[PDB]
């Protein structure tokens, strides 16, 4: 559709802050400064629902919502209607790992819950990794039957930013034909540097965790769960 | 009404939890143990909405919601016409300034925030103190326009709990006639210390700051201020 909601979804450090920053810039025309600029573009459901706000259930415009929930909680039902796409994005369930820690025992603890729990515990509106990489890209259609979806690997957004990230904004079909200079304008708008900024003004493998974690992982990785499922799947594992 | 939302709305500390404690005890007939238990027989809103959850907005029984968001937040409104009662506590602000920090140099900043915000900065759904006792207590019989408001203080809880919980379990009209015995064992159940063993369980002035702190506060509680003029009605001031 045109107007109506536009899900920018994920698992919790899946990509998702990036392509906010990049499209930030490329609707607003500058690059952001702080976190306060993203929310010009795109709305964040958790903090909206911090604050007892949430989006227009009878939206009159595209509107740009980020969340890391599940599809099918409650809430999200409420726009089942009004949801004109749907964007997903898919990180290697490791790097989601090694992200979230950002004192030895600290860590190794963390990582034996991630992969006890093939993900993170927000909570349960959060499903586990695979859970929620499943309801997202298959039940989509489903839960939004008015919407077009699209998945796409954090890792390939990350390879090829322009090609991608104009499929993306082509994807959302926010009224305006993409131009690609303006993509271009918007990734270079959120370089490393750039995204390392916005944290400071805004303010491998498991081995060294130790091999036996290592070891727990990999098992997690190619045995038989839905976490190592999906994985596959998304060229995650061998 | 019958069935239908009851709201166990406060500020943050104005007493909502020992409530709820009682609320679970008179109604399970077994004191909580954790807070887990008290979701038995209450919800969290803020709880709910964090994992994208929500209270059911066509309720076939009553419902006990315990919320701190101001009346108005965009979420409540899908309660209008669900909702049957509104219970709101009130609280000496000074009580739940000092309750909220629970190291001088740290307090007194937090204190001086406080009191330069009256109330807390969650954040702008919460609004300040003022703010959130106006809105409940003057605004929720537009806001719901089936339900019958009761407002109390902590303090005249705290004071006579037995006559007071058997006033609230009798206005939230749960479909049994109120036995005093059961007020009693309720009450009994949420002793100070049994209060202490679920946080345990489960896991003055302000001249100590500083007299100039102390002062602050008084010129604040005695001003020209929204958060002056509700707090002498609630005869926490002059």
Redesign the interface.
């Known amino acids: 559709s045109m107007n109506g909601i536009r899900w920018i979804a994920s698992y919790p450090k899946a990509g998702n802050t990036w392509l906010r920053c990049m499209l930030a810039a490329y609707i607003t025309g500058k690059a952001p400064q702080t976190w306060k600029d993203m929310e010009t573009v795109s709305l964040e ?2 903090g909206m ?6 989006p227009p259930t009878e939206p009159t415009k595209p509107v740009l919502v980020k ?1 890391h ?2 599809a099918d ?4 039902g409420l726009y089942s209607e009004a949801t004109a796409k749907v964007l997903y994005l898919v990180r290697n369930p490791r790097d989601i790992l090694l992200s979230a820690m950002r004192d030895m025992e600290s860590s190794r603890t963390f990582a034996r819950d991630f992969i006890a729990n093939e993900g993170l515990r ?5 499903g586990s990794w695979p859970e929620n990489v499943r309801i997202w890209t298959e039940s989509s259609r489903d839960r939004f039957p008015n919407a077009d979806v699209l998945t796409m690997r954090y890792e390939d957004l990350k390879g090829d930013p322009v090609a991608r990230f104009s499929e993306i904004v082509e994807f959302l079909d926010l009224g305006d034909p993409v131009d690609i200079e303006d993509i271009r304008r918007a990734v270079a708008a959120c370089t490393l540097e750039r995204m390392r900024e916005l944290e400071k003004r805004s303010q491998q493998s498991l081995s060294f965790l130790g091999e036996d974690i290592e070891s727990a992982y990999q098992e997690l990785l190619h045995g038989d769960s839905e976490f190592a499922h999906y994985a596959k799947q998304y060229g995650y594992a061998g």
């Open positions: 459901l958790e629902l911090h604050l007892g706000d949430m969340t929930l599940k909680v409650p809430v999200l927000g909570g349960a509106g959060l």
